[PDB]
Subunit: 309 residues, 3 copies
């Protein structure tokens, strides 16, 4: 029974892929991390292939649904999950086949940049985006995609180009967040969108993870500054969690996985650098437990026919 | 005749304590600064003890008044003055008794973080905070408290944890200020709140003072950048001063003391580092004259029964 | 036939002067750049003298028109073009006469700082500036003027004072842009103002150019971060260009020249530093072609009596 794949489902392979990469970065300290990384990376890649095929089906047979999501000043953002996940799968595959990895990384980089250049800029024409369009999902095309390009290009050796993407993401983040948080303060995000509060966890941690990927894992003043704001936001979101899930636990909670996985990834670098190793251990374990709970809730939802539309 | 202590009065020991610390940092250049520092520190500590006892009385006998201030999306911020001043008094007392200092510093740090995690985040639920709630006082829990933790923890030797608090404050500052200044441009702050424009002086100077405390007094590019924006804001506030006091000079002007004291503190580090020593001298003298005028106006108000509620 | 000079016309000598300085910075790599720099610098200086004389005439004989522009919460910003161009002409003239250069640089620096301190701060009184006043032109007094002071003072040897102005501009930029872009998203900028979207190109490139001028041309992490966001904005504005010129090509397009010239200037430093030399060459050529097109369209407009009011 055909259905149009909800684009947000790409957050699942995104979170798993990012978590694979976190474990990969533990390999030199703890060799057993290699197997955990490889298993997460294969599962993420397989889910990504499936969802890419489903989205190709959506494009072929439900094109007007894609067109409507693209032109929406809110829903367009989830499309950025496609190139973001494509790059992360490339990053995973690099351990086995750098040529294929490089192809995926460049496709995702050119894709995300074309996407933002076409759609993010178009918002500045005014009159379509409304105050109520000011949602955490906007971080995906505006911020997360650039950080992912930055870290992926660094992996391929393009450190200076990586810094360009890094800067685009970092400054875009601090330029958007002020108006997002003011909007949230004034207007209550409706329950149907609240799981996307998890995306608010992502910026600082995705930022510092990308930064450390480009700067050879040097845990410097900037990295520590970023981690601090990251943890502030974590604490805030923990306090907000009962409100986030007021209307029940749902699959949208995968929104938190990107920030959680990036907190795990950045923890490996802090630990390697002998900076706040206790905090690093807590962060790494915490993020893995939470993503583990997402996986278990997702298997549960699947073993009952409550997964796809 | 019992009364509920207005929470804002903690700005008095706050400003005096911060100024004690500024003079403390002049000791190695000018030994006579020691006595001035110690006198300011004892006076600040004594006033703090008195106000803590008064607030304990408020909690015991005027609890509903505290509850109302806590739940207000505007008035809650002044409560952050309590842990901020507790930490600064700890910092003062460190010169005489590090054990007692450490207790006060940790109580104020855990207290402020718990306070923001409970209340600052709760605003993001929407519908309580309004555009008109966008006031300079929000810098206290969001920004100043984190900088104070950063510098206090650095004093105790916890430089990396200090950088985490520093980053939380710095990024929180740049995330809030944009919407504050836009709000002020559009909506005239009512005279009763205008003295709190003095808090707008604080961020850059409290930021750079905390930064220099953590980075061993190294006056680097970041420090100079911060000072520049700090002085811009000083100039702006000087030009605005007749509007700020349109309806008369009042005790609320202690709002300026935190930024003034932090400008004095940071001046000592610039001077030590042989950076802009002339500017440093001007800044240090200017801040002391202005706080001196606050003290004289406050003694005046007291010698007439116009101090407490 | 007397007329009041539209203040925005100062953008012409501004763009040409900035471009002269870009070519000046190519001299050590390519000696022929000297002549191109000198020709652009003489033309910019001559146009600046003419426009200064015209504005002096405006002040003498059309003072109420100046007063109205000054008090406008939108139109005041263009006045900042006067001290900005004065400083850039000083920077040009430094190659021939440092004494005269120093006079112009200090006049423009004191002038711009006095101007912002009087007018930018006055906006914070509220009730005059409206949401609809949130225009790209605000970058001129708030941001561009400080960067120009920073680079001009560095030229004269005042590197630490230069960093103060730099910081004031950089932090002012990130404090304003968030609310500008949110405003543009919600409200369509009217065609008559759209050419000023070109000013949105300026911040990152003017910032990095000023930074590199102060830090001895060291292309570091900050510089690369700035360039990245700069290019993001360039791409966005390229995509937006047909909307910008919906109602036709007009002389207001000189708004883009400051950012274009600064992109050329910063390219020379990236090239010198052997960072992204290919990107540097593209940027330098692109900016010169676009400004060349502005010059040709302007000569065209002049050879038909469609230049002044
Ligand atoms: C994965 C992303 C796919 C998004 C595709 C939607 C593209 C825009 O779709 C349409 O194309 C036509 C022009 O070519 C025009 O009608 C419109 O501008 C637009 O509706
Ligand atoms: C997400 C990975 C690649 C994204 C490709 C997006 C294709 C969009 O397509 C474009 O959308 C524009 C709207 O802004 C339309 O006006 C264009 O004519 C259409 O070509
Ligand atoms: C939005 C927040 C941005 C903060 C930027 C932090 C500035 C980085 O700080 C710099 O880091 C270096 C590396 O450790 C130090 O040596 C420098 O002295 C320090 O200033
Ligand atoms: C990124 C965070 C994950 C790193 C997990 C490390 C867990 C190991 O634990 C640590 O092992 C050390 C030696 O190997 C011991 O010295 C430590 O005392 C112990 O805490
Ligand atoms: C110094 C700071 C003191 C602030 C105390 C006010 C705390 C909240 O007070 C109340 O407590 C009850 C739950 O425990 C609930 O009614 C409410 O959420 C709240 O009204
Ligand atoms: C300022 C120094 C310590 C602050 C302690 C604050 C105690 C707050 O108390 C809490 O406030 C919440 C509201 O956000 C209530 O809902 C909680 O149930 C109540 O426990
Ligand atoms: C919000 C504003 C943040 C600006 C961050 C400034 C970046 C710091 O700058 C860095 O400082 C070091 C120390 O002096 C230098 O060596 C670096 O080369 C310089 O880029
Ligand atoms: C933080 C700013 C306060 C520092 C105040 C310093 C006042 C001393 O003044 C300075 O003393 C020097 C030697 O000690 C002399 O060389 C200087 O010429 C003189 O200006
Ligand atoms: C190049 C910049 C010139 C701007 C000049 C306009 C200055 C303000 O002009 C007027 O001056 C009078 C006070 O002196 C008062 O009426 C007003 O505040 C103001 O209208
Ligand atoms: C742009 C180069 C120099 C600028 C000088 C500006 C002169 C402004 O002049 C002033 O404007 C104020 C308004 O904010 C008025 O209230 C003042 O009384 C008037 O002196
Ligand atoms: C608003 C965005 C501000 C970002 C500030 C970037 C921080 C600068 O970064 C610092 O630059 C130095 C010079 O290359 C490095 O050595 C430091 O290790 C690096 O952190
Ligand atoms: C700021 C950007 C402008 C610099 C333009 C440089 C153009 C020269 O071009 C370059 O010249 C080099 C040697 O001089 C050759 O090695 C290069 O291959 C060639 O690309």
């Amino acid at each position: 029974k055909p259905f149009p794949l909800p684009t947000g489902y790409f957050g699942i392979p995104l979170g798993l892929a990012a978590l694979s990469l976190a474990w990969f970065h533990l390999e030199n300290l703890f060799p057993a991390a290699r197997m955990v990384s490889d298993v997460l990376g294969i599962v993420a890649s397989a889910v990504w292939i499936l969802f890419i095929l489903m989205y190709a089906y959506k494009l072929r047979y439900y094109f007007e649904e894609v067109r409507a999501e693209y032109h929406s000043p809110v829903r367009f953002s989830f499309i950025a999950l496609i190139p973001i996940t494509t790059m992360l799968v490339g990053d995973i595959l690099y351990r086995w086949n750098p040529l294929i990895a490089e192809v995926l990384i460049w496709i995702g980089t050119i894709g995300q940049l074309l996407f933002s250049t076409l759609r993010v800029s178009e918002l500045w024409q005014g009159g379509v985006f409304e105050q109520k369009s000011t949602h955490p999902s906007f971080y995906l095309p505006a911020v997360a995609a650039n950080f992912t390009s930055a870290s992926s290009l660094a992996l391929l050796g393009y450190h200076d180009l990586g810094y360009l993407f890094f800067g685009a993401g970092m400054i875009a983040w601090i330029i958007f967040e002020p108006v997002l948080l003011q909007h949230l303060r004034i207007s209550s995000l409706e329950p149907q969108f609240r799981a996307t509060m998890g995306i608010v966890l992502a910026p600082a941690f995705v930022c510092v993870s990308a930064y450390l990927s480009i700067n050879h894992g040097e845990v410097d003043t900037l990295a520590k500054i970023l981690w601090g704001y990251g943890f502030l936001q974590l604490f805030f979101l923990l306090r907000l969690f009962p409100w986030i899930v007021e209307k029940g636990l749902n699959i949208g909670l995968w929104a938190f996985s990107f920030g959680l996985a990036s907190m795990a990834n950045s923890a490996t670098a802090f630990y390697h650098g002998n900076v706040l190793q206790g905090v690093s251990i807590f962060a790494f374990v915490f993020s893995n437990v939470m993503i583990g709970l997402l996986v278990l809730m997702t298997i549960y939802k699947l073993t009952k026919g409550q997964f796809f539309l």
